[PDB]
């Protein structure tokens, strides 16, 4: 009934489902976020920061009192033939 | 192991696993080691001892020499 070689888009599911909403905005509080979230918006630079943020994992394990790394002590079993 | 080849268990390497519970670290502490290790069943101890390796220092020099052989390859 409605196929138009002119517009190939409506013909296909090209249309954004009504879930799209191109409406206004949100409060001015954004002016704050835009200021402090800027260094993480660069990409690639952020890729690196997070990977080198893996330096946290090293720091957290080099220093860790309560993970089972001690026997605590025992007298070991010989044991099948010593 | 050298001083009593009959009554000691060879050690492959140490174990380091965060998931290990305390009974685990317990049971795997063997061969007179300060921590949980794996009991070697590759027979490298008998081989290395038979050819004339008596000290840890000897083993290191071999490791360095093989590392160097690995490079020139």
């Amino acid at each position: 009934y409605f196929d138009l070689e002119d517009i190939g888009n409506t013909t296909g599911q090209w249309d954004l489902y009504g879930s799209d909403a191109p409406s206004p905005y949100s409060p001015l509080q954004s002016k704050f976020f835009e200021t402090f979230a800027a260094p993480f918006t660069k990409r690639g630079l952020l890729l690196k920061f997070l990977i080198l943020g893996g330096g946290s994992t090293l720091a957290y394990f080099s220093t860790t009192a309560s993970g089972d790394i001690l026997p605590i002590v025992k007298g070991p079993q010989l044991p099948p033939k010593l | 192991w050298v001083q009593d080849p009959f009554h000691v268990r060879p050690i492959a390497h140490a174990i380091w696993d965060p998931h290990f519970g305390q009974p685990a670290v317990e049971a795997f502490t063997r061969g007179g080691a300060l921590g949980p290790v794996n009991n070697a069943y590759s027979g490298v101890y008998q081989w290395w001892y038979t050819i004339g390796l008596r000290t840890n220092e000897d083993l290191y020099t071999g490791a360095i020499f093989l590392l160097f052989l690995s490079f020139i390859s």
Binding site: L47, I51, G54, T57, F61 | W16
Partner: peptide
Amino acid sequence: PSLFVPLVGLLFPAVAMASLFLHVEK
């Protein structure tokens, strides 16, 4: 000592898997 390295043996998969992903989709 040996509690620093098995994690970089796990930082490495994170790094390797990421790099390879970029390589294969290029």
